Design a protein around this ligand. Structure first.
Ligand SMILES: CC[C@H](C)[C@@H]([C@@H](CC(=O)N1CCC[C@H]1[C@H](OC)[C@@H](C)C(=O)N[C@@H](Cc1ccccc1)C(=O)O)OC)N(C)C(=O)[C@@H](NC(=O)C(C)(C)N)C(C)C
Ligand SMILES: Nc1nc2c(ncn2[C@@H]2O[C@H](COP(=O)(O)OP(=O)(O)OP(=O)(O)O)[C@@H](O)[C@H]2O)c(=O)[nH]1
Ligand SMILES: Nc1nc2c(ncn2[C@@H]2O[C@H](COP(=O)(O)OP(=O)(O)OP(=O)(O)O)[C@@H](O)[C@H]2O)c(=O)[nH]1
Ligand SMILES: COc1cc2c(c(OC)c1OC)-c1ccc(OC)c(=O)cc1[C@@H](NC(C)=O)CC2
Ligand SMILES: Nc1nc2c(ncn2[C@@H]2O[C@H](COP(=O)(O)OP(=O)(O)O)[C@@H](O)[C@H]2O)c(=O)[nH]1
Ligand SMILES: Nc1nc2c(ncn2[C@@H]2O[C@H](COP(=O)(O)OP(=O)(O)O)[C@@H](O)[C@H]2O)c(=O)[nH]1
Ligand SMILES: [Mg+2]
Ligand SMILES: [Mg+2]
Lengths: 430, 123, 429, 428, 430
């Protein structure tokens, strides 16, 4: 019935702010927090992401967390920044300094109980809370560390509820903080254990989209954060908008996750656009169905053609021929059956929304459990094991109290998931 | 020849050929009261055996309608005694999961306190 | 001097309706009992304070209907309410039911009416029993009645009037079973028995009376008319057969062979062209042809041992012996070695009465004929085989043993019926 | 005196059909009062009807059904008013074509209630003959509960004659699969609990309507009509006075030569269609040969297959006995091989110069032929099909019954099948 | 008298109930308030002091939205608030939840309304359970209620109307689990189960109603025609015939062997006009077209143990037997050497009442043929294979086991089916 969002660190609060900018217009809510839209389907399931207030005002069910008042201030002193309840801004002055230990163990731990004071208040005023939504930076410190600390600490207090995350995997292409594969792997070790599902927003794919496709020479965060939110309104479309289903986080989890460690989804929206560009010609259902299953469209830098889809959930928006949709989806699977597991009967499920997004007559979201997600993890271990070999930068972690073996404990927990993803990839029915 | 004479009658034997052979030849109340009294025993016994054999069938029904009653009350035992186990076995299993996973967590909440300790140690 | 007539079950009861009908004709008694202007008629009628001559008769039936047809009839004013005995249900064509079952129930009570009948007697000769043979009641109770009357009224006569069964009439399948069991039980208790074959009465009502389908009443009309001829010698003042003990002597020489054959002439109808009435010379040749016989068994090939020619009315002795001599002239009529060849003739001067509003034609001269022939075993031989057939494969038996009987009683009766069939071989040499 | 119990869907319909058929012959108008032409009717009218002093004639009929469907039909029916409102004993748990439900459980709940009725109804009788039951052998109430009273009554009145009119289940008529299971179980009881049983077959009934009356769609009304005829046709020797002077026990005594061999083969002449078309009188020889031919028997057996132990024949309608008798003695001379020689003069003729309603003649038949073991072979085989694979048995065993009851009841019928054989081959 | 408590369990179970109950209101001219202007219909409806005819039904669901659509619906008045039961959180397409975790919290209250309806039954016949084969509520809760009622009401008749899953008509990867799971737990508690293959209802709407993309109503309405055609016999008393439970005696040869196959005819759209009408001899032959079956199977290949024809409208015995005659010649209709070659007929007086403003047109003569053929077992194996496929790799199982289920419940349940498969194998032997 209800969802509690949280955002951690720089990226967390940056990608999270944008999600709240997109879904407010998608619901006819103004920067003031008041409703002024036409259709009443915009209010049918509004309870999900919004708290009803006085003066018939809506306020997002979101907590703003960071060990730095930076992004925190730019957001608050920004566009839709007025919309959020100022009390929920749980902002410390430490600064995890791109350190997992600083956020999860040391400086972050000091804050966490203050954050939890707020999550408890938001969960209380819920007819039925279904679960939590986390938007965070996987290479950082508050995002990566404190964010997973917060997970473990929430998963403790509410084991019965869904734990869904939007984790942004770092790329040496986008960020040159050398320690990222340490904070990356350290966070993976935590996700595989305390989240129902995870959307892998890989910063590598994100960049290549803006660079090679969108032809933006010097992509700004704005150009990447736009692709993130476009995917996020997409994946959340059925949770937010009424229709065919019903439309629960647990119903998805149950159907989309066959094995519990493997809940990392490879998102991948079609049609790819440049931040704030006017759309000329829209695409047809074949153009959509086709483009949406392209590696060139995945938000994680993995080739679905190198793997096998355990599950797929494709979400189409706008007004289109479903018989044409069913014609196309069954063309795709029935021609490329080799990429889908024989031992999961009917692994591809398609949902359609008549409400398309801003400036798009038609869009089409992709959520798949392709074993090819191993490529993302593989990468990370090769980056980590390169540094951990020469035991590089380690004193940044140890000096925070952190143990040497905690790294090797995470390195191999990470190394297991890859063999585990491979195991099911090679696995056959016969 | 003559036999007798009367008012509204008369009689007279009339011989034709006399015999060649001179000379000619060559109930109790108790026993009825016993033989009758005996017949009624016989009648009253096979009709008493009929009564016995009919009263035997009268128990077969008294036994049959019982099987039906017992069959159902044991069915309702078997079913209720299944739910009792199933719901409890589940309550056992499910809660024993939630508590094992809160210990994994409890322990991985301790790892944190000893790190905040290993940091203080170094200082 | 007196005579109590007992009627057991339907056949004898219905037949005894016709008897006391003809008696109240020949005696001029009204169906109310009162009669206006030799005294021997009283051997059968006990006068009351109202001067009404109540018959010395006792009607018994194990089922109501039949006796209740008298309590309805013109002659309901004749008998007292006590003398007509009617139980709840009949023996249902069963000897064993009649005897041991419903018999026990009604016995004492029946003998009580008999006691009360015999209490008012100055020298009661015996009893004249009327019954069927294969009937439920006319076998079961009759044989039981003889059994206790022989004890209670010992050294006192019994004149059995039985109706032998025939398929040509209303017949029942079990009949030969009841017929044998009864004969064997009535055997030592009967003093003299007059067997009456129903098939013989049948064709007699057809060939002479011209009734192809005769009513029980039509058949009975003759039966009672031949019966009145046997009893004319008793109710009136005739010399021959004056006492019951005369038949027992005159006819019964060997005690066991006590079944005299009956013959009657003339066999006459009223609805036919009027002509010269029959004379003594005619009726003698009519009595010696089995076309008038009461039981169908050829006497021409059967040794005799007794004879009585019982004439009635306008008959004279010269013409009687004028006919007798002429019959020994042509016919040689075979007699046993131990017996004298001859007949104890007898004319009762009183007239032969016919039924007003009936078939029978008023004849001035008539003649009965009581004759003991070994040829009567040709009627038992019939019944013995039918009994032998059924019992051999044990058909219907279960109905009898269910009534309280034993299987022995069946074999017991046939073993003795064989003894009797041999007594006719031992005598008819 | 006769007490008429009518059990089940079939039994109540069949019974009501006879209970209007007889009233026509007895002048008892649909409301209950005498109106007839002569008093030859009223003479033997205490046999079936009673008085509401006076007059209003009430039948000595007891109505029984585990469901109220069939009862409300009779209640509404043309002659419905004629029955005593306190003689309809009906439940709500409709037996549902289950011998076990009717015989045990459900019917046993209502048994005692119905016996109170017979107890009371027997009080008005001066001297009762016995009881008469009409019922079906395929269903629940009739097949099961019927056999139940039959035992109960045999206990309450042990010396009182047990008469039934039993329709036999056929594979042609009625689609209820269980039927051989109900039949076998009810034959078992009838073999031990009745003095006489009239075996009427729906196989034989459907075929008379079809092959003979030419009836292309035989409805129950057409089937039941032939039965009602044979019902009053066999009860002419009771209902109608004459030289007979006969009863239920006399009939049984002269008919049943061995206890268990009491199953009767009813017959008829002429085979008239329901309604259509009256007219065209029948000759004497025509009336005999028809009646004695397998194409005129309500029991589905060939008499030329067995051997007649005992035979009954009530000729109704105006005729001459010389004509009638001549043709019967003509038949025994011809069919000498099919009549038991060791039961002398085993073929009894009954007459009555009163024709039934409409038709001016009739010739009802009741053979006691050993051929009837073909009727029992039919059932026993149909049973053994399902039973060897124990199919639909759960429906029964679920009512408290054991597999053993089926084992025994079948075995007891095979013993009767064999017993009938002993005399079919019997020679003096 | 002859009472019948109908029970509707979640989404499929409830929605189907609304097509059923709307039809009955038409069949016996009942208005959506309960009033109306043969009282044998009172076996399903209960007349009140006001004369209002309230159904002998219970609408049960673990989430509110479905039952809410009845409380707000056209016939909001038609039922008691008590007889429309709703949990807050659904079973999340999971049996384990519906049966235990979630269902436990309602079960007791649910049985109370069943008992508070059981009182007004002067003489009850039994229950009519309508459910989904693959829903969390549809499967889990149904077996818990089937289990509980068999304690509560002992050996009373429980007659299921189970919606077999088809991929075309929604579905969810886990469904074969929820399918096999319930089948097992309910097998003892069922008296007679009317299987409905969602594909066969789809395939008909496609072929005969001509609908390219059927709405749930399009199918539910078609299904409700088949269901009323089954329960016609009970809501009416027709001299012509109409005699159910008696069919059940021939249909069910053994206790486990309780699944009859339905074959409704004629399914004709409101677009013919010229074709009208169809003889009895046409519709009798229609019943033997695999294309017309409720469950997709081949009884032209498999043996028979029953055949029951449920005629209605304008049906007169003469031709029924001529129709019956022609088929008994055709050597496809092959029975077992223990089961007679009989066809249990039953004609209704009332004509097939059609839904005003519907898809199907008014017919003169409607038929439905219940039959106990070994070709039904195909439905089991079809589902048992899909089960075995995911179950081998133990895919999704964790969600079940996480709710309290033993790994063995899944093995036990499969063996029972394998036994049932062997039971249909054994019976079809001569
Ligand atoms: C490919 C790597 C980056 C994506 C990118 C970008 C950083 C960015 O977007 N940054 C660095 C903080 C500010 C932000 C950007 O300025 C351009 C503002 C307008 C923005 O996107 N604002 C966001 C909000 C925001 C989000 C996240 C962080 C800060 C601000 C908005 O309004 O949408 O340009 C500097 N580039 C090319 C770089 O940072 C540089 N190259 C690199 O990254 C190397 C050398 C490979 N490490 C230089 C070539 C400049
Ligand atoms: N001649 C003659 N024979 C009769 C008469 N009534 C019955 N019978 C014969 O009697 C035999 C049967 O015996 P019944 O005396 O009638 O039977 P029952 O059982 O004694 O009498 P119920 O008490 O009526 O049952 C058959 O041979 C009948 O022909 C009758 O009036 N005259
Ligand atoms: N025939 C038909 N099938 C339906 C309908 N609604 C759902 N289904 C089927 O039901 C199955 C899914 O189960 P549901 O009954 O919808 O789920 P539930 O758990 O019972 O209900 P909720 O959890 O409350 O949503 C699928 O196989 C669907 O095809 C309907 O109206 N008609
Ligand atoms: C109450 O109805 C009847 C009762 C009986 C008989 C009978 O058939 C004529 C009936 O009509 C059906 C009867 C039957 C069979 C006999 O032998 C087979 C017999 O010897 C004798 C008879 C009957 N006796 C006569 C003289 O017909 C007595 C019993
Ligand atoms: N997609 C995206 N990546 C970002 C953004 N801001 C920072 N990052 C990424 O976040 C990671 C560093 O984490 P950061 O959010 O700065 O740290 P924190 O303040 O300790 O949570 C790097 O991998 C950056 O590429 C943003 O707005 N969008
Ligand atoms: N002749 C005839 N047979 C019937 C009638 N009704 C049903 N049957 C037969 O009765 C048998 C089934 O028993 P039934 O009377 O219906 O069931 P009950 O109500 O439980 O006694 C089958 O063999 C049917 O053929 C009817 O009125 N007449
Ligand atoms: Mg008698
Ligand atoms: Mg569900």
């Amino acid at each position: 019935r209800e969802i509690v969002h949280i955002q951690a660190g720089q990226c967390g609060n940056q990608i999270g702010a944008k999600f709240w900018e997109v879904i407010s217009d998608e619901h006819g809510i103004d920067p003031t927090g008041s409703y002024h839209g036409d259709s009443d389907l915009q209010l049918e399931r509004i309870n999900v992401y919004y708290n009803e207030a006085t003066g018939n005002k809506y306020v997002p069910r979101a907590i703003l967390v960071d060990l730095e008042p930076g992004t925190m201030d730019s957001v608050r002193s920004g566009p839709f920044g007025q919309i959020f309840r100022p009390d929920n801004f749980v902002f410390g002055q430490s600064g995890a300094g791109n350190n997992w230990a600083k956020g999860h163990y040391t400086e972050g731990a000091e804050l966490v109980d203050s954050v939890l004071d707020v999550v408890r208040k938001e969960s209380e005023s819920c007819d039925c809370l279904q679960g939590f939504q986390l938007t965070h930076s996987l290479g950082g410190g508050t995002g990566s560390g404190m964010g997973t600390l917060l997970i473990s600490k929430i998963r403790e207090e509410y084991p019965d509820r869904i734990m869904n995350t939007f984790s942004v995997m770092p790329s040496p292409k986008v960020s040159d903080t050398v320690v990222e594969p340490y904070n990356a792997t350290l966070s993976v070790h935590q996700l595989v254990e305390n989240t129902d599902e995870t959307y892998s927003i890989d910063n590598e794919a994100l960049y290549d989209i803006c660079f090679r496709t969108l032809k933006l020479t010097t992509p700004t965060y704005g150009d990447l954060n736009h692709l993130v939110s476009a995917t996020m309104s997409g994946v959340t479309t059925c949770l937010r908008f009424p229709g065919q289903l019903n439309a629960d986080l647990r119903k998805l989890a149950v159907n989309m996750v066959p094995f519990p460690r493997l809940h990392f989804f490879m998102p991948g929206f079609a049609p790819l656009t440049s931040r704030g560009s006017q759309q000329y010609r829209a695409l047809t259902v074949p153009e959509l169905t086709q483009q949406m299953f392209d590696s060139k469209n995945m938000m994680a830098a993995c080739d679905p053609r190198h793997g096998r889809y355990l599950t797929v959930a494709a979400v189409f928006r706008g007004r289109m021929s479903m018989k044409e949709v069913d014609e196309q989806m069954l063309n795709v699977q029935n021609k490329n059956s080799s990429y889908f597991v024989e031992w999961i009967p009917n692994n591809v499920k398609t949902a359609v929304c008549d409400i398309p997004p801003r400036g798009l007559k038609m869009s089409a979201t992709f959520i798949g459990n392709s074993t090819a997600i191993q490529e993302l993890f593989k990468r990370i271990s090769e980056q980590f094991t390169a540094m951990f070999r020469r035991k590089a930068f380690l004193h940044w972690y140890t000096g925070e109290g952190m143990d040497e073996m905690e790294f090797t404990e995470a390195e191999s927990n990470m190394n297991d998931l890859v063999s585990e993803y491979q195991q099911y990839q090679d696995a056959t029915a016969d | 020849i003559e036999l007798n004479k009367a008012t509204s009658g008369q009689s007279w034997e009339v011989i034709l050929k006399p015999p060649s052979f001179d000379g000619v030849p060559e109930p109790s109340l108790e026993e009825i009261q016993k033989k009758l009294e005996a017949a009624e025993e016989r009648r009253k016994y096979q009709e008493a055996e009929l009564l016995k054999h009919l009263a035997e069938k009268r128990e077969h029904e008294r036994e049959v309608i019982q099987k039906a009653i017992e069959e159902n009350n044991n069915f309702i035992k078997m079913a209720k005694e299944k739910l009792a186990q199933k719901m409890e076995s589940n309550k056992e299993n499910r809660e024993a999961h939630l508590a094992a996973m809160l210990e994994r967590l409890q322990e991985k909440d301790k790892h944190a306190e000893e790190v905040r300790k290993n940091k203080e140690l170094k200082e | 001097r007196e005579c109590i007539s007992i009627h057991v079950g339907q056949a004898g009861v219905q037949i005894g309706n016709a008897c006391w009908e003809l008696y109240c004709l020949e005696h001029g008694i009204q169906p109310d009992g009162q009669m206006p202007s030799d005294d021997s008629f009283n051997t059968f009628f006990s006068e009351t304070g109202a001067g009404k001559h109540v018959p010395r008769a006792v009607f018994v039936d194990l089922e109501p209907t039949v006796i209740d047809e008298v309590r309805t009839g013109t002659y309901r004013q004749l008998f007292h309410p006590e003398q007509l005995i009617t139980g709840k249900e009949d023996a249902a064509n069963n000897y064993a039911r009649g005897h041991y079952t419903i018999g026990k129930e009604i016995i004492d009570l029946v003998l009580d009416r008999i006691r009360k009948l015999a209490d008012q007697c100055t020298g009661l000769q015996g009893f004249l029993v009327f019954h069927s043979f294969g009937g439920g009641t006319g076998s079961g109770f009759t044989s039981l009645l003889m059994e206790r009357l022989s004890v209670d009224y010992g050294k006192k006569s019994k004149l059995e009037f039985s109706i032998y069964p025939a398929p040509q009439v209303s017949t029942a399948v079990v009949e030969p079973y009841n017929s044998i069991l009864t004969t064997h039980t009535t055997l030592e208790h009967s003093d003299c028995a007059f067997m009456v074959d129903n098939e013989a009465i049948y064709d007699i009502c057809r060939r002479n009376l011209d009734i192809e389908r005769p009513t029980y009443t039509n058949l009975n009309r003759l039966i009672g008319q031949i019966v009145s001829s046997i009893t004319a010698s008793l109710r009136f003042d005739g010399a021959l057969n004056v006492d019951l003990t005369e038949f027992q002597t005159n006819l019964v020489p060997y005690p066991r062979i006590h079944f005299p054959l009956a013959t009657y002439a003339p066999v006459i109808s009223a609805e036919k062209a009027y002509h010269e009435q029959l004379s003594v010379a005619e009726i003698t040749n009519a009595c010696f042809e089995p076309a008038n016989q009461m039981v169908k068994c050829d006497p021409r090939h059967g040794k005799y041992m007794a004879c009585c020619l019982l004439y009635r009315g306008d008959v004279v002795p010269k013409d009687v012996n004028a006919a007798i001599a002429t019959i020994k002239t042509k016919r040689t009529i075979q007699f046993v070695d131990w017996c004298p060849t001859g007949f104890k003739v007898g004319i009762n001067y009183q007239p032969p009465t016919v039924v007003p509003g009936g078939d029978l034609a008023k004849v001035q001269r008539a003649v009965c004929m009581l004759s003991n022939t070994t040829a009567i075993a040709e009627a038992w031989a019939r019944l013995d085989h039918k009994f032998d057939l059924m019992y051999a494969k044990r058909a219907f038996v279960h109905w009898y043993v269910g009534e309280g009987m034993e299987e022995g009683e069946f074999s017991e009766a046939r073993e003795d019926m064989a003894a009797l069939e041999k007594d006719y071989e031992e005598v008819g040499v």
